[PDB]
Design an enzyme around this catalytic site. Structure first.
Site, PDB file in Angstrom:
ATOM      1  N   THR A 102      29.474  70.522 -27.938  1.00 25.62           N
ATOM      2  CA  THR A 102      30.268  69.405 -28.424  1.00 25.62           C
ATOM      3  C   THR A 102      29.416  68.177 -28.739  1.00 25.62           C
ATOM      4  O   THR A 102      28.210  68.177 -28.470  1.00 25.62           O
ATOM      5  CB  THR A 102      31.335  69.088 -27.357  1.00 25.62           C
ATOM      6  OG1 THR A 102      32.271  68.275 -28.030  1.00 25.62           O
ATOM      7  CG2 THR A 102      30.821  68.365 -26.116  1.00 25.62           C
ATOM      8  N   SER A 148      35.070  71.881 -27.024  1.00 25.82           N
ATOM      9  CA  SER A 148      35.552  70.523 -27.288  1.00 25.82           C
ATOM     10  C   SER A 148      35.475  70.090 -28.754  1.00 25.82           C
ATOM     11  O   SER A 148      36.237  70.663 -29.509  1.00 25.82           O
ATOM     12  CB  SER A 148      34.765  69.627 -26.337  1.00 25.82           C
ATOM     13  OG  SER A 148      35.299  68.327 -26.241  1.00 25.82           O
ATOM     14  N   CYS A 149      34.662  69.168 -29.285  1.00 21.62           N
ATOM     15  CA  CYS A 149      34.638  68.914 -30.734  1.00 21.62           C
ATOM     16  C   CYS A 149      33.985  69.992 -31.604  1.00 21.62           C
ATOM     17  O   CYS A 149      33.994  69.893 -32.831  1.00 21.62           O
ATOM     18  CB  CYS A 149      33.933  67.590 -31.019  1.00 21.62           C
ATOM     19  SG  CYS A 149      34.803  66.195 -30.281  1.00 21.62           S
ATOM     20  N   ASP A 184      42.253  70.731 -17.576  1.00 21.52           N
ATOM     21  CA  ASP A 184      41.372  69.893 -18.353  1.00 21.52           C
ATOM     22  C   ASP A 184      41.826  68.439 -18.258  1.00 21.52           C
ATOM     23  O   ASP A 184      42.967  68.113 -18.579  1.00 21.52           O
ATOM     24  CB  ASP A 184      41.428  70.388 -19.773  1.00 21.52           C
ATOM     25  CG  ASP A 184      40.375  69.860 -20.727  1.00 21.52           C
ATOM     26  OD1 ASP A 184      39.915  68.715 -20.620  1.00 21.52           O
ATOM     27  OD2 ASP A 184      40.025  70.632 -21.608  1.00 21.52           O
ATOM     28  N   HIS A 231      37.308  70.812 -17.868  1.00 21.88           N
ATOM     29  CA  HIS A 231      36.979  70.819 -19.281  1.00 21.88           C
ATOM     30  C   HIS A 231      35.740  71.659 -19.595  1.00 21.88           C
ATOM     31  O   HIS A 231      35.651  72.256 -20.662  1.00 21.88           O
ATOM     32  CB  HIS A 231      36.760  69.390 -19.737  1.00 21.88           C
ATOM     33  CG  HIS A 231      36.588  69.269 -21.243  1.00 21.88           C
ATOM     34  ND1 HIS A 231      37.463  69.547 -22.194  1.00 21.88           N
ATOM     35  CD2 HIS A 231      35.468  68.798 -21.869  1.00 21.88           C
ATOM     36  CE1 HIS A 231      36.951  69.266 -23.355  1.00 21.88           C
ATOM     37  NE2 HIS A 231      35.748  68.813 -23.148  1.00 21.88           N
ATOM     38  N   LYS A 232      34.769  71.712 -18.679  1.00 19.12           N
ATOM     39  CA  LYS A 232      33.572  72.512 -18.880  1.00 19.12           C
ATOM     40  C   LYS A 232      33.710  73.869 -18.208  1.00 19.12           C
ATOM     41  O   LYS A 232      33.060  74.161 -17.204  1.00 19.12           O
ATOM     42  CB  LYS A 232      32.344  71.749 -18.327  1.00 19.12           C
ATOM     43  CG  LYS A 232      32.017  70.434 -19.023  1.00 19.12           C
ATOM     44  CD  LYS A 232      31.703  70.689 -20.484  1.00 19.12           C
ATOM     45  CE  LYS A 232      31.245  69.410 -21.133  1.00 19.12           C
ATOM     46  NZ  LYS A 232      30.943  69.609 -22.540  1.00 19.12           N
TER      47      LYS A 232
END
Ligand SMILES: OC(O)(C(F)(F)F)C(F)(F)F
Length: 256
Positions: A10, A79-80, A206, A234-235
């Site tokens: 990300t 993520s992004c 998350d 999130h990770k």
């Protein structure tokens, strides 16, 4: 079956967040490429040299261009990272067996490239101690950011060990979401990006890409497969590495 996974970090991160997942996939027999995108990880460029998400994606596009005819990869973006997948799929859809989204943004083809990022900023508006700056590239003012250490601790690396969070404080760099550049970018196409298989992996635990945003993305642009990992943060390639490798083995055995 064995597949060639191309792992895509990300923004503000690098290939290093995959340092636990890449040996696990290899111990399953897979080939794994963990790229540093432009101005990320140990890539030599600085973010002020990058004028768009497309330029930022150059290491992935150059990698895909170098694959010999008939070699396909499974892209895995966190993520992004979903936006780099969408950019790559519009240039190299024949070389992509499938795309796995890992607590990731899921762009679509009916709204502008920034759409999902505009909705993320509405669901998660306070980035705590994250700092911002601006720079100009090709006549456009771009907002750069450097993720705050408390945001890193509480919202991205919530349940990660202190040695994993230490790597994030040491290695995260200035990046940019290039949101205003994405807003004026041509839409991702139905024949390139729209044609690839999309597997959506997520956890309702998350703390940045909250369940409202992720469930909103699943309803907005229906994935071919959805995997929900219990627990973690999130990770997930750090807190649920084993679980992500099992899901990726299943994707490898399903999408050719
Ligand atoms: O993906 C991020 O690192 C960002 F790049 F969008 F900043 C986030 F997790 F912090 F959101």
């Amino acid at each position: 079956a064995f597949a060639h996974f191309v792992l895509i970090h990300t923004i503000c991160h690098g290939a290093w967040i995959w340092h636990k997942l890449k040996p696990l996939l290899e111990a399953l027999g897979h080939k794994v490429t963990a790229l540093d995108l432009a101005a990320s990880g140990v890539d030599p460029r600085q973010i002020e040299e990058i004028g768009s998400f497309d330029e930022y994606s150059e290491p992935l596009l150059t990698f895909l261009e170098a694959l010999p005819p008939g070699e396909k990869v499974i892209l895995v973006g966190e993520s992004c990272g979903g936006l780099n997948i969408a950019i790559a799929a519009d240039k190299y859809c024949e070389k992509i067996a499938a795309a796995v989204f890992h607590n990731s943004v899921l762009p679509d083809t009916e709204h502008c490239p920034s759409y999902v990022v505009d909705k993320l900023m509405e669901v998660f508006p306070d980035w705590k101690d994250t700092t911002y700056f601006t720079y100009t590239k090709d006549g456009k003012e771009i907002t750069g950011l450097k993720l705050g250490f408390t945001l890193l601790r509480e919202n991205l690396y919530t349940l990660c060990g202190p040695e994993e969070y230490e790597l994030a404080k040491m290695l995260t760099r200035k990046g940019s979401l290039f949101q205003n550049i994405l807003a004026k970018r041509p839409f991702f196409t139905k024949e390139g990006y729209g044609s690839i298989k999309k597997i959506y992996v997520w956890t309702d635990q998350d703390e940045i890409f909250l369940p409202e945003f992720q469930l909103w993305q699943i309803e907005n642009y229906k994935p071919d497969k959805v995997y929900k990992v219990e627990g973690g943060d999130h990770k997930l390639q750090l807190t649920k590495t084993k679980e992500i490798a099992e899901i990726l083995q299943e994707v490898a055995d399903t999408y050719n």
